[PDB]
Structure formats: structure tokens, C-alpha cells
């Protein structure tokens, strides 16, 4: 009877929600995110099969609002659906309260929606994990990763995809030493963490890197110029 | 606040250089915001224990008890139990202690912490034992065990059992001590591995 969307096994064990987690892991890529002292960074693999595609057409980063960036890990259709739903939510939030939705509220809304999907045995838990990056008045570089199961947890450093676990361990190790980083230190930490967990050297092409800074509350997907600049510099 | 931090860093420096001046600074601050005073008290007690000036601890307790929790932190048990542990750990056990634990148990009915009251009475029993007074220790420890029979398993219960066994071995002859020791060890078979109490049992 576990075949249903969400029906407790003898001891619970919502097997379909766990399968949604496996679908996320099988999304096919990986992403990492970190928050600095006043600047947050995020990186994500980016492949271009067949040498076609490329351009901004293929990507996984999305500006939910002018001050909130986000990244996806999961079935591209599901992820884009989540992205546009969150865009709708944030726009309505601005239209209602008059102020940009805090990342906490944005993730809370998506988490509640995914929980409703799990709850009612008619909407599947769509297989993708969302991560939001933003700046707050009194929290600076906020990072919050939300999952279809309904957790909206904020990490000083997070990771999504197959290597989420190894990346998390590496981030724990690195943060254990003087978490007080600058912008360059943070971007280096993120890029090097992803490089360690992938065991791959990076051309500026096959990756996407986004950033937010307290001085510049504007999600910025750094161009190939800055990506390669940082790569060659370190 | 900022001033208090200034004199606290100065007290650290003067502890490093010449402890007398740091002690005077800490005592002045204590005589002198609530966080300032509780800190001042903590470092004053630390310095007094380090230098061996424990004869003033009794007066400190006596004149802080009127306002101990009144100033703030009805949970000032922090400082109370810290002072008690520091004094008991001080094994010189010289003078003082007269009317000290009596007034502390009196407490003007302000803490009403059953656990802290039990711990204080148990340490009073241990002190009576160390002071060669074993029948008083027997009486009060028997009272304490008959009262807090339920749970307390491990830790404090084992400590009370060992005090009883030592008193038995002292005056009540070794049979009662043997019985109390067997009870203590069996009751402590599932301790959380506190080395201090383990060594006392051994």
C-alpha cells in the first residue's frame, strides 16, 4: 500500500518521500553553497552535452527576485516548476506586504507546498531540492536549503546532489577553522570544495557560480570572465 | 558593562603580573551591571581559591545570600553550586563551615531547589565525616537516603552510600560497612563512568 503517494508503512517510512530523495540525488548534477561574513556564494556543475545548447539557455541558476538567487538539483521540469512557483510566491509577497520576501519565508512557503503534496495522496512530491541565497537586514548572507519533504533548513554551508554528504563533511572541516571569511576566501572555499569533491579541474565553462554581497544586494551569476579570473588566480 | 570589561581584562593582566592587585580589583568590582556583578563574583571566587584565601568565602556567601537571587537569575544556582564545589574541592578543610551550611540550607526560603538542597545536605554530611564526626554523619545520611530513596541512582546516591560505608567502617564496625558497600556497588553497576566516584568506590 506504500505505492500510494504517502501512506505509512508498518513503522512509518514514507517510502515514496524517500524515493523522492533518491530522485533528487539522481537529478544528475551537484551544487554547493556557503555564506561568508557578509557575502554568500554558490557553485554548481554545468554540462553541455553534444556541444549544442550552452548559452544562458541551459543552466540551473535562477533569480527568484532581484535580491534572491536560487539553485536547483532535480528533474529539470520539477525544478523549473518549483522555481516559477517560488517566483509567484515572492511576487505576491511583495504585492501583499510591500517588501521583498525574506528567504526564510520563501523557503517556508515552498516547504509547506511540498508538504501538502506529500500530505494529500494526489500530488506527487516533485523530485528536486531548492536552495536560496539572499541578504537580510539583520542576518547578512542568508542561505536556506529546502527539500520536497518540507524541511527549510539554513546551513552556513550546504550541498545538494550525489556528493552532498562528502561536500558537507569537507565544509564542516573547512568551517571548523576560522569561519570568518572574506569574499575571496568564501568563493575560494566553495570552488575548491566542489573541485575536491568532484576530483575535476575546471575550465570557466562547465560551471555556474552565483554570489550575493551585503554591499551589493543583487544576486549575480558571475560571467565567464570573472569565473576564469578566480579559477586562474587560485 | 564596557567599564566592567575594562577592569576584567585589567584583572587578568594583574593576575598574570602580581595577583594581589588583581584580587583587589576584583574585590572592588564585587563591592560595586548584574552581569558585571555576577562575573566579578565568579572571578573573585576563582582568585580566592587560587590564592587560598577561603576564609572570606563564608562572609561572601553570608552577605550575598540576602541578594543572591534577588539581584537576578533565580537560577543563580550557577554561582551557588560553583562556590560549593570550589570549597569542597579545596581539601585543606580549615576552619569555617560553622553555621555556613546551616545558613545556606536556611536560605530564607528563596531557592526551594529540591535537588540542590539534597546535594548541599549530602556535602554537609561528607564534611561532618571529614571532621571526625561520624554519628552526626550517620544520622543525617540515613535521613537523606530514606528521604531521597527514589532514583538518584548513580552519582549522588552512590556518594551517599560511600559516606555511609565510611562512617560504618569508622565506628559502626565493618559488617555494616560491608553491607553498605555491596549496596553501593550494585546500585552503581550502571554509572555513567565518572572517574572521581569510580575511584572513591575503589
Amino acid at each position: 500500500f506504500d505505492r500510494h503517494i504517502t501512506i505509512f508503512s508498518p513503522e512509518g517510512r514514507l517510502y515514496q518521500v524517500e524515493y523522492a530523495f533518491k530522485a533528487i540525488n539522481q537529478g544528475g548534477l551537484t551544487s554547493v553553497a556557503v555564506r561568508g561574513k557578509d557575502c554568500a556564494v554558490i557553485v554548481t556543475q554545468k554540462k553541455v552535452p553534444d556541444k549544442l545548447l550552452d548559452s544562458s539557455t541551459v543552466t540551473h541558476l535562477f533569480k527568484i527576485t532581484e535580491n534572491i538567487g536560487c539553485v536547483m538539483t532535480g528533474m529539470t521540469a520539477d525544478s523549473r516548476s518549483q522555481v516559477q512557483r517560488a517566483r509567484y510566491e515572492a511576487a505576491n509577497w511583495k504585492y501583499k506586504y510591500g517588501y521583498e520576501i525574506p528567504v526564510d519565508m520563501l523557503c517556508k512557503r515552498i516547504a509547506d507546498i511540498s508538504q501538502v503534496y506529500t500530505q494529500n495522496a494526489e500530488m506527487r512530491p516533485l523530485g528536486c531540492c531548492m536552495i536560496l541565497i539572499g541578504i537580510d537586514e539583520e542576518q547578512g548572507p542568508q542561505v536556506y536549503k529546502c527539500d520536497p519533504a518540507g524541511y527549510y533548513c539554513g546551513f552556513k554551508a550546504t550541498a545538494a546532489g550525489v556528493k552532498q554528504t562528502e561536500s558537507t563533511s569537507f565544509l564542516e572541516k573547512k568551517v571548523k577553522k576560522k569561519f570568518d571569511w572574506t569574499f575571496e576566501q568564501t568563493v575560494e572555499t566553495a570552488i575548491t570544495c566542489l573541485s575536491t569533491v568532484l576530483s575535476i579541474d575546471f575550465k570557466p565553462s562547465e560551471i555556474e557560480v552565483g554570489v550575493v554581497t551585503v554591499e551589493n544586494p543583487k544576486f549575480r551569476i558571475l560571467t565567464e570572465a570573472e569565473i576564469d579570473a578566480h579559477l586562474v588566480a587560485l | 558593562a564596557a567599564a566592567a570589561v575594562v577592569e576584567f581584562q585589567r584583572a587578568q593582566s594583574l593576575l598574570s603580573t602580581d595577583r594581589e592587585a588583581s584580587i583587589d580589583i576584583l574585590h572592588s568590582i564585587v563591592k560595586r551591571a548584574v552581569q558585571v556583578k555576577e562575573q566579578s563574583i565568579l572571578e573573585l571566587g576563582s582568585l580566592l581559591a587560587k590564592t587560598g584565601q577561603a576564609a572570606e568565602l563564608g562572609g561572601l556567601l553570608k552577605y550575598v545570600r540576602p541578594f543572591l537571587n534577588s539581584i537576578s537569575k533565580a537560577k543563580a544556582a550557577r554561582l551557588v553550586r560553583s562556590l560549593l564545589d570550589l570549597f569542597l574541592d579545596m581539601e585543606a578543610a580549615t576552619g569555617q563551615e560553622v553555621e555556613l551550611c546551616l545558613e545556606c540550607i536556611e536560605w530564607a526560603k528563596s531557592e526551594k531547589r529540591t535537588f540542590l538542597r539534597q546535594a548541599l545536605e549530602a556535602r554537609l554530611v561528607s564534611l561532618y565525616f571529614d571532621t571526625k564526626r561520624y554519628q552526626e554523619a550517620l544520622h543525617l545520611g540515613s535521613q537523606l537516603l530514606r528521604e531521597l530513596k527514589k532514583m538518584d541512582d548513580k552519582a549522588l546516591l552512590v556518594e551517599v552510600q560511600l559516606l555511609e560505608s565510611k562512617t560504618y567502617h569508622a565506628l559502626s564496625n565493618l559488617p555494616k560497612a560491608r553491607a553498605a558497600l555491596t549496596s553501593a556497588r550494585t546500585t552503581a553497576n550502571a554509572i555513567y563512568c565518572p572517574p572521581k566516584l569510580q575511584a572513591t568506590l575503589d
Partner: protein, 49 residues
């Protein structure tokens, strides 16, 4: 073999990952060891995907 093996702990278990990062490029070069193709030897094509 795989994980479902009774209980044999202690030793020195090593994970062997099916995908390969760029030693996939390596492996395809070794398997291209067969006679040169009479010209351009770059593997870039299969390298990309």
C-alpha cells in the same frame, strides 16, 4: 562484491566508483591503443561527453 555480506567487519573496504572524472578520458585512450587512425588522434569528441 556488494554490501549485503552477512557480518565481516574488523578489513580495509574500498569503494570503487563506476563513473570516472577524467580517467574516463584515460581509459578511452588506453582502449584507443589500437592502431592509429591515420591522422588526427585527439579524443576531444568522446572526451566532451
Amino acid at each position: 562484491t556488494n554490501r549485503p555480506d552477512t557480518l565481516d567487519p574488523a578489513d580495509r573496504k574500498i569503494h570503487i566508483d563506476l563513473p570516472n572524472e577524467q580517467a574516463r578520458l584515460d581509459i578511452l585512450k588506453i582502449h584507443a591503443g589500437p592502431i592509429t587512425k591515420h591522422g588526427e588522434i585527439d579524443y576531444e569528441a568522446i572526451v566532451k561527453l
